[PDB]
Amino acid sequence: GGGYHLFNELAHSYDLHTPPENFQHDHAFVLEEARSLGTPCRLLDVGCGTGALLEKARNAGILATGIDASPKMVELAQARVGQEAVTLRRMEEIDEEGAYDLVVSLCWTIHYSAGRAGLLDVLKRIHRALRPGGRGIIQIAHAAHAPKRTLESRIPGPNGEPDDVVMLFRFRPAPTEEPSMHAEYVYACKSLNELLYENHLLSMTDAHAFAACAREAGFAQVTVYDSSKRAPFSAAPNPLVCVEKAH
Ligand SMILES: Nc1ncnc2c1ncn2[C@@H]1O[C@H](CSCC[C@H](N)C(=O)O)[C@@H](O)[C@H]1O
């Protein structure tokens, strides 16, 4: 999961190519949910990347900690929020028992689980890691709503060279038994003579299939929002799944 080059050599570049509004709205949603859980709030960010959300959460008074399977992400996150709040650790290793009030997994981290069996294992570990009444926020990929185009992002190079850096990206459902998606990334920095291609296999990229899996993992309540706006799921390619553990 954390071994893909996108999250290692290109970890900092991953951040630069993520639209700012995407970060601001989803992070605000998380902080809103933390408030609705009371004070203090113990939060685990599963796949925290460079730790932007952990910073916002900790600045808001949340007892936020994170895990990521990428060594380069952990290093970047620890530089932002210190060493004790971030751990190199796979979501498949989660073994806490009731330690958190809110578990968050944004930006499709959960689909790096190995198939449905892997997803169910991780969701059950997340379920066990939450207190009774605790909640989870999982951002998923609904592959059937993926853009039907190869997308492109251009940004200036290390010394301001215009369009020196390009990413092309393609998301398509795979013809598999279980709903899954091939997420293809191409990275190029022309001035530095860098060219990377990489094909991420993402498992259970279907909002209805994911919700049913969340139920099977033990969550009493499961809600799918179209976005941080909290509208009902309709056409979003990256809806938000909110789950609650029974009392
Ligand atoms: N099995 C796994 N366990 C923990 N983290 C994983 C993982 N597989 C992939 N990841 C991590 O999940 C991230 C997916 S992209 C991260 C962006 C996301 N918006 C965020 O919260 O930061 C990467 O940092 C990658 O290293």
Numbering used by the authors: -1 to 245
Give sentences from the paper.
Based on sequence alignments, CgnL, named ‘MT’ in the original crocagin publication, was the likely candidate. Indeed, incubation of 4a and 4b with CgnL and S-adenosylmethionine led to the formation of 5a ([M]+ calculated, 509.2395; observed, 509.2391; Δ = –0.8 ppm) and the –2 Da 5b ([M]+ calculated, 507.2238; observed, 507.2239; Δ = 0.2 ppm; Fig. 4c and Supplementary Fig. 21). The mass increase of +14 Da suggested methylation and thus the production of des-carbamoyl 1 and 2. The overall shape of CgnL was typical for class I S-adenosylmethionine-dependent methyltransferases with a Rossman fold. The electron density for S-adenosylhomocysteine was unambiguous as expected for a well-coordinated ligand.
Here we use in vitro experiments to demonstrate that three proteins, CgnB, CgnC and CgnE, are sufficient for the production of the hallmark tetracyclic crocagin core from the precursor peptide CgnA. We further show that the hydrolase CgnD liberates the crocagin core scaffold, which is subsequently N-methylated by CgnL.
